[PDB]
Amino acid sequence: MKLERVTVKNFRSHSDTVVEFKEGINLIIGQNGSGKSSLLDAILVGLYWPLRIKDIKKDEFTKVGARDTYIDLIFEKDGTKYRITRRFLKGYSSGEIHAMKRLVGNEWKHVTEPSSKAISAFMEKLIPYNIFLNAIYIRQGQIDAILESDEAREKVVREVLNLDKFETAYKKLSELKGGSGGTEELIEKVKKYKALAREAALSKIGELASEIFAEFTEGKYSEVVVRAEENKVRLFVVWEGKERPLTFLSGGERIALGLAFRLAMSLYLAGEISLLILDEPTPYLDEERRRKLITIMERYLKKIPQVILVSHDEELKDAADHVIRISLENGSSKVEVVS
Amino acid sequence: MKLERVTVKNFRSHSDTVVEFKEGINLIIGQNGSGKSSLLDAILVGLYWPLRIKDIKKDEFTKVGARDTYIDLIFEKDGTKYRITRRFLKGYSSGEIHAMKRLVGNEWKHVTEPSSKAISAFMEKLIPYNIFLNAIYIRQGQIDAILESDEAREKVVREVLNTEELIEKVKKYKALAREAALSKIGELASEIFAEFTEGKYSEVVVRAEENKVRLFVVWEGKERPLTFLSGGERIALGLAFRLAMSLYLAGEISLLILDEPTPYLDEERRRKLITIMERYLKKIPQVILVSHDEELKDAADHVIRISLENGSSKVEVVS
Ligand SMILES: Nc1ncnc2c1ncn2[C@@H]1O[C@H](COP(=O)(O)OP(=O)(O)NP(=O)(O)O)[C@@H](O)[C@H]1O
Ligand SMILES: Nc1ncnc2c1ncn2[C@@H]1O[C@H](COP(=O)(O)OP(=O)(O)NP(=O)(O)O)[C@@H](O)[C@H]1O
Ligand SMILES: [Mg+2]
Ligand SMILES: [Mg+2]
């Protein structure tokens, strides 16, 4: 998956903004209240409306003084370039218009009926909503969300592992029944092989998270243990040779672990999904940890085909591949392409 | 309320720590993983055990390698000096000792039966737990908690604030006292938030409605909902409202403990925080501030440094 162009009119601080995204680390740099998250949430609205997210509401997100909100997103997936267009009318949801098209040669052509329902169904088939919200787009303040519960984590992990190319093949063979030694034996074989493949994926996620978290904490925590048990995915950190629960960590260490785990999932998915969007990675991190973040950008974020990073921290500029500066001018966001 | 001395043995990273708190801004500076929040949570445990907070578990907070945890707190309230002492023994219960005493004449005297239940009951009457957690000690990550719920805000405020036709006039004075209290908090919050945001938001509106306390920010002359704010702005508003509440109660409570005020703040807002420490935090008789941000040392009255050496917190008194 690759975002190419985002056009936004009258969404929060954005009156008329166009952003071209590219390969590599795209950094959006801006002060508090400049329009960074507004841009990222417009992308989320563009892709997945209707949302049932409490802090995102149409009546609220229309720019003050305007009546009409417009979002136009162009992205690539599996070789096909897609375009989704949405228009919202403030306080009057009957002028609301939605469209999703694909690029056929030189022409944009409808890929489904121009309706929220049809577009939603199509998008869900392209990239499941739960995968996007919990493994691709990490909203401001949600870095440690995947640490807080054996509910959201188990679900996203299971759904992430479900993206494996052989998953549907496994499930099918599991359905046949001849009551024969051949059928039973084969289904048992498939079930075992699938379980081992998952365990390997989870081990690989644990390996990556361990390497990143050890780098982050200068070896203070020697491993991040990721263990599937029944309907749970357990997470531990190893300190002085033994597994400890996540409450062992400090507030800053928790952010560091969240980043480690997010990155590890994105790296495991670098081929299948290939996109990470991260909004303000520095909260609670001390000076040393922010420095390590730059190192981890160089060594890990560079290994994900497309990354969109948003921050107020100027020191991250040097580690990005493309820099866009956003600022608030006359009550409207202004976007400047630096790199 | 004033904190005087906290003594901690084998609590998280603390093998053996003593900290003396004083009047004014007490800043504890330390890196990630050094022992700052551990110290503050030990104070919470010391005062209000048993707690039913998910991330604070007796079986977990005993320092690794050790068996016995000890917390000893000295504090003043309403002119009386109190000492609470707790000893925990991991895995077991009946071996534990809890005591609370007051300075009568020369020596410490039990205020109640030396038991968790009796002490809990006494502490609740002296300083209700809900007031301590919601208005006095703001835990790491909780700065904006008070921004979340009209009804939750209502409860905190409610607790922190408190012939045949004579019943009609009773409700009148009550709603008037309430509205005046809210107006003052609003005024204080507005002043602080406006300074914090360089006048981007001209006012913070704190409005009484039945069962609720509504919160709005004024932008370009109109009230907007809290969702209008950016992430960093929300932190600044949380700080403004917390400070406003502490300032309103400076004569009754007089203590504020804040853990890591700088998350999500940009460089400009972090510099502004220092100005706000100088102008407002210093109006609160005792403040305990802990942070990894060295820049904050500027406006502190007393500075303590904490660092982790060979697996244990070490406290250094700088000033
Ligand atoms: N409906 C609206 N109309 C006009 N402006 C709005 C509207 N809603 C929100 N805003 C403003 O949009 C600004 C930017 O919000 P946001 O994009 O979340 O900030 P940010 O760049 O992500 N900064 P931060 O997270 O604090 O570092 C806010 O400061 C609001 O003042
Ligand atoms: N039972 C324990 N025994 C020994 N060490 C522990 C124990 N529990 C937690 N720790 C350690 O205590 C350290 C300090 O935690 P904490 O006091 O929360 O950090 P902090 O100083 O507040 N830093 P931060 O919030 O990240 O800026 C942690 O980093 C853990 O390694
Ligand atoms: Mg933001
Ligand atoms: Mg802390």
Swiss-Prot record, chain A:
Keyword Kinase annotated: no
Known function: Part of the Rad50/Mre11 complex, which is involved in the early steps of DNA double-strand break (DSB) repair. The complex may facilitate opening of the processed DNA ends to aid in the recruitment of HerA and NurA. Rad50 controls the balance between DNA end bridging and DNA resection via ATP-dependent structural rearrangements of the Rad50/Mre11 complex. The ATP-bound conformation promotes DNA end binding and end tethering, and alters Mre11 nuclease activity. ATP hydrolysis promotes both Mre11 activity as well as HerA/NurA activity. Also has reversible adenylate kinase activity.
Record-given protein name: DNA double-strand break repair Rad50 ATPase
Gene name, Swiss-Prot/TrEMBL: rad50
List of residues binding ATP: 12, 32-38, 60-64, 140, 220-221, 248-253
Keywords recorded for this protein, A-Z: ATP-binding, Coiled coil, DNA damage, DNA repair, Hydrolase, Metal-binding, Nucleotide-binding, Zinc
InterPro entries: ATPase_AAA_core, P-loop_NTPase, Rad50/SbcC_AAA, Rad50_ATPase_archaeal, Zn_hook_RAD50
One Pfam family linked to the record: Rad50_zn_hook
GO molecular-function term, one example from the UniProt record: identical protein binding
Entry text on domains: Binding of ATP induces a closed, compact conformation of the Rad50/Mre11 complex. ATP hydrolysis opens the complex.
Gene Ontology BP term (one): double-strand break repair
UniProt key word Metal-binding: yes
HAMAP family reported in the protein's UniProt record: RAD50 (MF_00449)
Assembly and interaction partners: Homodimer. Forms a heterotetramer composed of two Mre11 subunits and two Rad50 subunits. Homodimerization is promoted by ATP binding.
Curated annotation (Swiss-Prot), chain B:
Biological function: Part of the Rad50/Mre11 complex, which is involved in the early steps of DNA double-strand break (DSB) repair. The complex may facilitate opening of the processed DNA ends to aid in the recruitment of HerA and NurA. Rad50 controls the balance between DNA end bridging and DNA resection via ATP-dependent structural rearrangements of the Rad50/Mre11 complex. The ATP-bound conformation promotes DNA end binding and end tethering, and alters Mre11 nuclease activity. ATP hydrolysis promotes both Mre11 activity as well as HerA/NurA activity. Also has reversible adenylate kinase activity.
Name listed for the protein in its UniProt record: DNA double-strand break repair Rad50 ATPase
Entry-linked InterPro entries: ATPase_AAA_core (IPR003959), P-loop_NTPase (IPR027417), Rad50/SbcC_AAA (IPR038729), Rad50_ATPase_archaeal (IPR022982), Zn_hook_RAD50 (IPR013134)
Signal peptide region: none
Domain notes per entry: Binding of ATP induces a closed, compact conformation of the Rad50/Mre11 complex. ATP hydrolysis opens the complex.
Taxonomy, superkingdom: Archaea
Family: Belongs to the SMC family. RAD50 subfamily.
Pfam family, one: AAA_23
Organism of derivation: Pyrococcus furiosus (strain ATCC 43587 / DSM 3638 / JCM 8422 / Vc1)
Binding partners and assembly: Homodimer. Forms a heterotetramer composed of two Mre11 subunits and two Rad50 subunits. Homodimerization is promoted by ATP binding.
Annotated positions binding ATP: 12, 32-38, 60-64, 140, 200-201, 228-233
